[PDB]
Each structure stands twice: as C-alpha cells, then as structure tokens.
C-alpha cells in the first residue's frame, strides 16, 4: 500500500508536469509557425512591389531610346 501511495502521487506530478510541457511546446510551435507565415506574406508583398519598380524602369528606359532617333 505504501509503494502504491507513492506511485499515485508521482503519477499526478508526472501528468501535471507533462501538461505544462505539452502546452509550452504546442504554444512555441504555433507561435513560430505564425512568425514565419506572416514574414513570408510580407516578403511576397514587397516582392511584387519591387518588380513593379523594375518594370517602371524598363518603361523609362524604353522611352529613352524612342526619344533619341
């Protein structure tokens, strides 16, 4: 009975400890997955606006030929 009385209380610690563990992990994972996903969305936004900046130059550098002829 004494051996069992210890097994029970150590089982309660192990389970409450592991709840803390899982929670701490599941949180850290979805908080990192969020940071990556948002940074990516911003990266692709900035990407599109920077290819409009080089298309804008291909227009300013297309006219610069037409003018001189």
């Amino acid at each position: 009975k004494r051996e069992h009385e210890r097994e029970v209380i150590q089982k309660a610690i192990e389970e409450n400890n592991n709840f803390i563990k899982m929670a701490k992990e599941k949180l850290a994972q979805k908080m990192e997955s969020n940071k990556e996903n948002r940074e990516a969305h911003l990266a692709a936004m900035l990407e599109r606006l920077q290819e409009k900046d080089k298309h804008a130059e291909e227009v300013r550098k297309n006219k610069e030929l037409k003018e001189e002829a």
Partner: protein, 428 residues
Amino acid sequence: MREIVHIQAGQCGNQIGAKFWEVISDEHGIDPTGSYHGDSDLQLERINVYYNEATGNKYVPRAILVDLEPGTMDSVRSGPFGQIFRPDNFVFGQSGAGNNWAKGHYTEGAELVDSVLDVVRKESESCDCLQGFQLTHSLGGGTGSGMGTLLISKIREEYPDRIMNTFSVMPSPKVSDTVVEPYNATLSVHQLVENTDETYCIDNEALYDICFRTLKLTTPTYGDLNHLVSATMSGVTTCLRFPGQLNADLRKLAVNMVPFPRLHFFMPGFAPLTSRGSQQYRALTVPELTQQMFDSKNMMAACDPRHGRYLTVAAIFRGRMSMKEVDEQMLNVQNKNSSYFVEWIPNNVKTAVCDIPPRGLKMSATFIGNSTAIQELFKRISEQFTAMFRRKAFLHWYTGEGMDEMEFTEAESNMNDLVSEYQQYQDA
C-alpha cells in the same frame, strides 16, 4: 488493555468528536477547564481510559484533532469544551480536501499524515497499556474519508496488534447533495473491511429519517443529527468507560461481536429517542426500552433487521432499574423473535447494566447488533456508485490526483464481495 487514543478527522469527524467529548465529560464530571466536580466515584474509576492526568490533577482528553482546513477546528477550539483539548494535539493544514478521497488519501493528506502520527506516537508512549484507537469521521467527504483511512492503514503498520475501532458516518442523498460521495464511501469501505476490527455504521439516512419522522423535526440540523450520534457514542462506549463485566475493552468486544474478520460492521440502536427540545419527563419502563431498542425506528443504520439475522448482539442498559426485569425482557425478545437470531451461534445476545444513566435521562438502552441486514446499507452505496461509474462520471477529479479506474473497480469489487459474504451467513 487500558488506554484508548481517540482521533477525529474532517468536518463531520471533529463535530461529532467534539460532541462526544462534551457528553462523556459531563458524565464523568469533567468541566471544560478539565477539573473534576462530580458526586459519584464511579466517574473516576476508569477515567484513565479516555483521559490523561496533568498537574493540578486536571484531566486532558486523549484526543487528536485532524483536518486539512482550519475551519471546523477553529470552531471546536472556540467551542464549549474547546480549551479542554491538548493545544499541541491540533494538527491542521490549509489546502482543504474538496470532498475528494484522492486528495485526502494520496496527495493533500499524504503531505500532513506524518505530522499527525507524531502526536499519535507521543500519546501512545504515555500509555501504560494501550488497547487501540477509535476514529470518528464521515465516509462521504475527503479528509475524514480519504485521510482517515490512510491514518488507519498507517497506524495499523505501527500498532498491528492493537484494536482499530471506528465511528463511520455513512453518506445519504437525504442529507448531502454532493454527487461524488458514493465514490468516497466505496473507496473507504474497502479500507475499513481490511484494516478495522470494529466499525459503528452511523447512517445519515437513518439519522435524518429519525429526526424527521419520529422526532417530528421538519428542518433537521447537523446539531439534531449529532445529538443522536452523541447519544449513541456514549451508550456504545459505556461498557468501556465505567466498571462492568461484559465487553469491557475493545478486544473483548471484538471477540464477542466479530465471528468473522471482515464482518465487523455493527448496527447501533438507542432508546429512548430524544431531541434537544424534547422534554422526556416520563422515564420508560424496562419493557419499553427493550421493544424500542430492537425496533427499526431506533436503528442508526437504516436497515431492516427483519431482512437479515443477528450474528451477535450487545445490549447496554443505563440507570437504576430492576436488573432482574432486564434479563426477563432481554430473554423475551430472543425467545419471541428467535427466528431472527442465527442458531449456529448459541447465546449470541449479551447484556450489561450500568447504574449511572446518561445526561437528562433516568432510563436508557443502547443497541449494538452485528446484523446481516447491514448489507442493505452497502447495497445502497453500491448502486449510487455504479450509476456514475458505468459512465465513468466525475472520475477526472480523482484521476487528476493520480488515481486510476482500476482502483475504483477493485473497491467496487471488494464491497460487492462484502455484501455477498453477509448474505452467505444470512442463509445458514
């Protein structure tokens, strides 16, 4: 076989424990400060059974007060006899048990149990010859139920040759609306079958029905319920507290009352039934004490003794009366209702007569029956239990504290065995 160590655990335990000490103190002529002021000397003959002596010849109860919250014990300490108890024998925590057997038996209670056993040990060394221990507690809560049974299991380890006695208050939906009490009770019973020699089954279903039906109290209070318990406890221990011939110590009582090690769950009765408001101007006749003390209305266990058979009976009469007439009426019941007594235990009814009556009465009779009808009580709890357990309801409170479903199944299984064992000898 001289000194008894008393322990009271939890809310229910400390309330009835206190009331018990209130009563017998008055009977033994001990005042709240602990000095003696009584007439007869019968009061001081076996005073050493429940009390210690100190300087100034003050009498201190051999009692240990246990709880996991300070509530009830602060109230007891500011109660009537509050200052009588040994201040160091107050052992309480703060967390509480939350009516959870697991909290009381495995976690919150384990954190406190060692400190209690230190006070037990100190009292047990003061003993010239220790008989054993009597515990007072409920089986429906957490502290008294869970921590109480833990203390028993632990005490049996240090004192395996001593006698373990208990006043165990069985739960009833008529008194408590806490849904988990059947879990607590079933778990406790398992412990009690294994680790007690004597258990007085004080049923709150009985105490309520008695208060409401017989005593005509439309709104029974704990004080009303406890007045009955207090009266029963006084009577049941009378043979222990005053000079007598029968069942004069816990072991002798156990040998007379317990034909089989597991079947040690007694059915207490009392007469005349009294309320704190009742007048009781007219003392009862000896025949009246007898017809009532065997009447189901007077049983504190809420079982119909006509549904089973008496394995053993102890009957205690108090007050100045015709000891001649006591024997005739006692022999009358046995010979009238001979079918309800097992034939394979000859002369299973034993009687004692103490001259000093209980407080406020001239004539009183107390009943202690090892009836096989006690199974009805365990059957009741078993049904309340399975109703929930088949759907695994409310188990998360317990598994959260480290327990497992298997431990419930075993407790359920063992109490079902107890019921069947009580039935085995009922048809013998």
